Design a protein around this ligand. Structure first.
Ligand SMILES: NC(=[NH2+])NCCC[C@H](N)C(=O)O
Ligand SMILES: NC(=[NH2+])NCCC[C@H](N)C(=O)O
Ligand SMILES: NC(=[NH2+])NCCC[C@H](N)C(=O)O
Ligand SMILES: NC(=[NH2+])NCCC[C@H](N)C(=O)O
Ligand SMILES: [Zn+2]
Ligand SMILES: [Zn+2]
Ligand SMILES: [Zn+2]
Ligand SMILES: [Zn+2]
Ligand SMILES: [Zn+2]
Ligand SMILES: [Zn+2]
Ligand SMILES: [Zn+2]
Ligand SMILES: [Zn+2]
Ligand SMILES: [Zn+2]
Ligand SMILES: [Zn+2]
Ligand SMILES: [Zn+2]
Ligand SMILES: [Zn+2]
Ligand SMILES: [Zn+2]
Lengths: 394, 395, 394, 136
């Protein structure tokens, strides 16, 4: 049992700093206010303001981050090694629950299960397994000559094939299903504006996933794909870069969350240009970047649900909180930006008893130096992290 | 040669009346009822015993490996066949003369069935399903190996035409009926009991093809949404039916959908099975299912739904099937209704005539028992005389 | 414990009937003499003479015995069902240890393990797994058209292929290795007098098997294959139908046991002719039958070790004891015939503590009506069977 | 690790219907040669093989030799050609002899090593890597 004495805590619903102590037992926030101090151990942390543990709705924790010629023939296990490292970095940054949204060989379930079993430290991961795509789509790997005839793990090309891949992902322990509805920036030979998958295929994916109580995320930059994903019944649209007034309203009507990664565009065009990102990808980034944040601002105003998704993996894991500054700059209040990373994500994830400092809820608590409603860039350097009643950072 | 059964009196399963008579048995049928011209050959003098028709179980798994421990880990599938021989005898000796085997691999169930039929081994007449059909990762699938193995079990199908083909394949290799998983289950790893498995289109395809070949369809379904779908697809029986509500009990009544409910086996799983080697995930899913199923069993009987005697023997010991009768009367059936559920009700479900009744022309599947079963139903738990097809197997 | 009081017991070495009691503890014969019936519990069988449990060195317990058109498309599991039936029949006939010498799919290890676990009743089986043969050999199944290109489980065609099949059999639990060194009677398109396998292949089979502590049996009718099998170093030659003076001496020198089935030829030409045995097989039986028993007589005289192998499976399981009468008629004393089925087999099998009613040995004991040295045909109907301290027949 | 079909390095935990053999299973000198080459291809520093049965595996005789000497020599020759060292798992005496005779750089466990073959190891610079603690 822990008793947490602090400068106060953010009531995320109201936007209030409230001065109270927190009693923690069985990894849950047991009690809030003045508590009987005779009992057990005390976390004296009186200068820090406490916020609920942060959430990212779009990460790629597992994957090889080694670069250069020496890493060319690396096995898939190197990506699992990197997953361990990056899971720690994500948690230490104050992110306690994340949505891993594409990985190969179910190494994402392995890292998730290892965290859950307390083998390694990291956030609670909700994992997708291999993302589902058409032949030659964004989800497919178009880097080998046709003599190889290589298609990646999640490539499906009929409603029933798609159905079966959803079933196979669930079999090997996926929490959600992810699919590419358009082309993308980071892949080779994909049109960002063209729709990938027929609506029948998209509907089959969504129907099957929901039947198993799994939520569906859809990668979609181009407008025609965003429309189709919403119409198919997805729970979130990732990126949503060219969303217009009419289909923002479609999303509002259908409770479709818009998981928009407005920060990562600056990394790709700046730091990523000489990091090793291809020339074809940088040109597709120009088409997407500036237009996405304009649409982000419009979508928020019109009233669409937007979550905090960063596409961490492209940029460094642990730097996820840099998106908060971008989020307020493009039309959100500091409170709204933090709500997008807590209560909004919680609903999207379909997990209750997280995202709020409230009695009964899980003890996922982040301590921060300044007031986050005054300066949101304090989230970029957190000073206390507790996940499930365990302290990982001081 | 002919036999004369001098009994304390047989039970007319239609009426409830212990009609005192004698029975002449020739060619494996009941030829004469009443006082007969004692003409021919030998006399089965067994006058302490009340006579009932041979008992039926609509849900068994006779073939399967019952060996436990580390020593049995790399056993071939033939061990499950060996056990099948053992368990077939144990089933017949417990007074069950016709059973419906409802899920087995490699058509070993048709091999055991045929062996019994050929007189190679002793056991009940089996109606066999072959491999049960299920989706990838479903209850019918084996979810115990790593993804690297990419293992899916025999009856895994994932499209209406794949499903169609599997029904045809089972028929090709000698199946009598078709069985499929409509929801997740208790005993499997990584299955949601509440969630539906298969699309309705898939289910309808299975049913349509099976019925086209004169095969009946059983559907494993715990969750309500899958029970609805199975009935709507047109199955002949819903196994378990654990979360069936008022509305869909009426659906079943309207469509002649039998409810094959296993109310006994839950006590074995939570009690004896907890230390026997049943996984922690399975025991938690049993607590969700068990108590609620029997409440729904009581409600379904009262609303007027056809319920058969199905035990899920294989989980518990084969031979102990008759233990469910006590549970059956306790949960709203009369002693007569519980025996009817194991005789006439099952015979219709099985689609076999000339069985389930002590009547002239019917098959000589006759069980002798000590006390009156309408007085004490637990006498069925220890039968003293078993005749199957005019041959005596127990005295 | 068990205290067996009988008329007496056959001393298998001397041929005398010793009067004593037999104390049984933990499956072994603990004491032989006048024994204080002390703790427990007495088996009074005063009319019966006790002999060691009988052995067969050549059986096929697992295999489909169903005939007619209805059995044509039977799965291999029907052979397993029949295996259960035939194991019981073998044990009730007073055979407590047998050597099963060819079966498919490791169904023989399944039946053996089921008996060992006490799931079913039967003798202790020593099993071979699939017999090794060349393409188109006696061990191969030559009943399908060439379009099918079917070769059976144990077909090997190089020394390293043969090595690997031995290793594979051991992996899936075989006790011994069996191979075809010549063509046979019961197969289609095989020359009985032609050698199958090169010597190099034969030597590789034997070397690998011996390296693992497995014994090697070789099916060999034709003289030239018998020679080769002995030269390769086999522990037994099955059938050995055309063995001459020179190679009988080869067998004596090398301790090569001759497992000869003299009875079964009368079944094949008589009962089997109408049972469904093909015309090509009956003609090859006429070449083998009469000549084999003449050679059996010569080999015994010259001093070669001959065990009791019947080829049960062709004829009915349980009728194994009929070979005893044939065995005395062709040059053995009644004692020598029973010795061939007890002490001789035990050595061949490589199992100690069986085959003798002796202190420390296993309680494999058969009770019989008359004296077996007076009338050997009492073995054809035994009255008492105990295997490993358990009574199966009274 | 390289091993025979059904050996200590093989995994004998599945039914014969699966026909599963593990990654390093080799059953001829040239197969063995190839697996050494494959291991080197994907970055191995040394080669390890099972020369006898072991404790922790299912269905293996600890005192029986696994691999022919020819196979063993092929493994060692090929590894040495690439400047890789060879370790050999060996409990039983008859396998330890063979591994030394084949020219391994170390014998792992070496549980039943006698006077004569300790001298063989000394003469050949064969290191004995012995795990005396783990049995407790
Ligand atoms: N707003 C952005 N440009 N985000 C980057 C998109 C990255 C995404 N994985 C793709 O390849 O399409
Ligand atoms: N009353 C019961 N618990 N019935 C369910 C028995 C187990 C069932 N075959 C399953 O795994 O789903
Ligand atoms: N002595 C004999 N009858 N030998 C022939 C027995 C049949 C033997 N299994 C074969 O086909 O060769
Ligand atoms: N006494 C010992 N060192 N025992 C442990 C041996 C471990 C080795 N991996 C084996 O199973 O063979
Ligand atoms: Zn958590
Ligand atoms: Zn994307
Ligand atoms: Zn992404
Ligand atoms: Zn706002
Ligand atoms: Zn019948
Ligand atoms: Zn079920
Ligand atoms: Zn069942
Ligand atoms: Zn009633
Ligand atoms: Zn024995
Ligand atoms: Zn033969
Ligand atoms: Zn034979
Ligand atoms: Zn003699
Ligand atoms: Zn080792």
């Amino acid at each position: 049992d822990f008793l947490i004495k602090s400068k106060g805590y953010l009531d995320i619903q109201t936007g209030e700093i409230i001065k109270a102590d927190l009693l923690i037992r069985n990894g849950k926030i047991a009690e809030i206010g003045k508590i009987n101090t005779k009992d057990a151990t005390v976390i004296s942390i009186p200068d820090l303001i406490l916020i609920p543990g942060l959430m990212d709705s779009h990460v790629h924790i597992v994957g090889n981050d080694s670069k250069g010629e020496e890493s060319i023939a690396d096995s898939s296990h190197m990506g699992t090694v990197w997953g361990v490292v990056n899971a720690e970095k994500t948690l230490m940054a104050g992110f306690t629950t994340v949505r891993n949204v594409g990985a190969a060989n179910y190494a994402d379930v392995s890292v998730r299960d290892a965290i859950e079993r307390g083998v390694i430290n990291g956030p609670t991961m909700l994992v997708s397994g291999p993302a589902l795509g058409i032949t030659g789509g964004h989800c497919d790997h178009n880097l080998l000559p046709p003599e190889f005839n290589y298609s990646s793990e999640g490539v499906v090309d009929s409603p029933w094939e798609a159905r079966k891949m959803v079933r196979k992902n669930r079999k090997y322990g996926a929490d959600l299903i992810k699919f590419c509805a358009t082309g993308g920036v980071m892949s080779r030979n994909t049109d960002v504006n063209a729709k990938q998958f027929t609506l029948e295929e998209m509907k089959a994916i969504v129907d099957e996933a929901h039947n198993h109580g799994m939520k569906v995320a859809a990668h979609a930059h181009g407008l025609i794909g965003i429309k189709a994903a919403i119409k198919a019944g997805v729970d979130s649209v990732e990126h949503a870069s060219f969303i217009d007034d009419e289909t923002i309203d479609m999303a509002i009507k259908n409770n479709t969350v818009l998981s928009m990664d407005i920060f990562v565009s600056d990394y790709i065009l700046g730091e990523g240009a000489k990091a090793g990102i291809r020339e074809e990808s940088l040109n597709k980034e120009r088409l997407v970047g500036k237009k996405q944040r304009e649409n982000f601002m419009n979508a928020h105003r019109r009233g669409a649900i937007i979550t905090f998704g960063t596409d961490a993996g492209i940029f460094d894991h642990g730097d996820n909180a840099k998106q908060f500054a971008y989020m307020v700059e493009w039309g959100m209040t500091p409170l709204e930006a933090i709500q997008a990373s807590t209560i909004k994500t919680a609903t999207l994830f379909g997990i209750e008893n997280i995202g709020q400092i409230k009695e009964g809820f899980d003890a996922d608590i982040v301590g921060v130096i300044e007031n986050p409603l005054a300066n949101i860039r304090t989230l970029e350097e957190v000073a206390f992290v507790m996940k499930e009643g365990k302290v990982y950072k001081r």
